[PDB]
């Protein structure tokens, strides 16, 4: 429906620290220039923290300590569209990146939020995960999964036997480790005696380095029960 | 900067109960006080405005009060979809701050983590690194302790502890922790162990291997 009111962002990503990125949100289902916009952003794992703000008219901007001096927030009111100029970048701007509508003609209290965007921030290169079986080996269930090691940047997705294996599957979030790489495991609890007769795979794909790498996950050779 | 001090850090209740979320103002803010809920991987959605009105739309359950620097959020009665994190924002000036965040979370009964121990794989190993995992399984409430052992010597530094958000069905929680060494440090050593405490074991639990063995 038109009446959707929808503020859909682009132009995150990858980038160096010292790197330079500008975001783009373009609205709509209402009339742009009416209304005070601002950009929230959100860390990993932590709270919400406002970054700037315009005006309707867009001549006066204003914006946190924390991104004062190397970021510039702007509109383009003829194109529905509203940035933020990200220079000087540092590791601790990784974030998702979130553009938002103020409520009212006074106040940046934010009403309609985009979906947001990963901005990643970090002298790694784009690498596919390596994939290590947790192998299996308690009330006749066994424990089994796959650890999704050293990958960059976030996310990776994990499915079982193709999305068929759902039931008892934990995925955890990841980590950034002192490489600057991430990690996660996933596990699936499942009947000990579907060990050796049931194949497990564990599906992962990561999208921004195109790789997809599916691991079986059996018991140890060495295991014989 | 106005500073926003949410109340408790996490409140844990059962559907149906009443939960009252608070949000304390360092100075006035003329009341424009603001409320959003946020579950994992979705984008905030507003609650309350600024003169503690019910945005439309929300539902009825949901309202806010306060004045001066002390402000409330209630639910009078909890649904299942309630359970979320709740933040509060002062929209009076510049710089806006919000609060630092109150998960509301599914009460349940005590369940006691079942524990489980990974050594490196072979494939791993030759690729030049060893991770040790020790999975804590389907636990409630969220506090557990996970220490390694490695030939008896407690270590620190070396390991990273992940959880998964509640289960959707049985609302437990699961917990990695994963032990990362070089494979030169993991060949120096022969017994492995996790030692978890929970409040649902009567006593600390510990799952080890000897990497001289299947």
């Known amino acids: 429906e038109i009446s959707e009111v929808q503020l859909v962002e682009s132009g995150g990503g990858l980038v160096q620290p010292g790197g330079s990125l500008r975001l783009s949100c373009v609205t709509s289902?209402?009339?742009?220039?009416?209304?005070?916009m601002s950009w929230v952003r959100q860390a990993p794992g932590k709270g919400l923290e406002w970054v700037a703000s315009i005006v309707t008219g867009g001549r006066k901007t204003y914006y946190s300590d924390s991104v004062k001096g190397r970021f510039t927030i702007s509109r383009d009111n003829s194109k529905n569209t509203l940035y933020l100029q990200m220079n000087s970048l540092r590791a601790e701007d990784t974030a998702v990146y979130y553009c938002?509508?103020?409520?009212?003609?006074?106040?940046?209290?934010?009403?309609?939020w985009g979906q947001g965007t990963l901005v990643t921030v970090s002298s790694a290169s784009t690498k596919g995960p390596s994939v290590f079986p947790l192998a299996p080996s308690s009330g006749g269930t066994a424990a089994l999964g796959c650890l999704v090691k050293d990958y960059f940047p976030e996310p990776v997705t994990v499915s079982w036997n193709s999305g068929a294996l759902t039931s008892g599957v934990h995925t955890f979030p990841a980590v950034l480790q002192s490489s600057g790489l991430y990690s996660l495991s996933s596990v699936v609890t499942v009947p000990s005696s579907s060990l050796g007769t049931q194949t497990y795979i564990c599906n992962v794909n990561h999208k921004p380095s195109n790789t997809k790498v599916d691991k079986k996950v059996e018991p140890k050779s060495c295991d014989k029960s | 900067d106005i500073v926003l001090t949410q109340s408790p850090a996490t409140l844990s209740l059962s559907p149906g109960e009443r939960a009252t979320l608070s949000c304390m103002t360092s100075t006035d803010i003329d009341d424009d006080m603001n409320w959003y809920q946020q579950k994992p991987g979705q984008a905030p959605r507003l609650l309350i405005s600024?003169?503690?009105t019910l945005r439309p739309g929300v539902p009825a359950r949901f309202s806010g009060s306060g004045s001066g620097t002390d402000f409330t959020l209630t639910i009078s009665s909890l649904e299942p979809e309630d359970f979320a994190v709740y933040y509060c924002l002062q929209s009076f000036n510049v710089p806006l701050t919000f609060g630092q965040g109150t998960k509301v979370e599914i009460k349940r009964t005590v369940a006691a983590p079942s524990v489980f121990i990974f050594p490196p794989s072979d494939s791993q190993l030759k690729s030049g690194t060893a991770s040790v995992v020790c999975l804590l399984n389907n636990f409630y409430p969220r506090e557990a302790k996970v220490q390694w052992k490695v030939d008896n010597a407690l270590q620190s530094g070396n390991s990273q502890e992940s959880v998964t958000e509640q289960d959707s069905k049985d609302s437990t929680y699961s917990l990695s922790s994963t032990l990362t060494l070089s494979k030169a440090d993991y060949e120096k050593h022969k017994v492995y162990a996790c030692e978890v405490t929970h409040q649902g074991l009567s006593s600390p639990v510990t799952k080890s291997f000897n990497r001289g063995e299947c």
């Open positions: 600024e003169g503690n």
């Open positions: 289902g209402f009339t742009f220039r009416k209304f005070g």
């Open positions: 938002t509508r103020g409520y009212s003609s006074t106040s940046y209290a934010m009403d309609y």
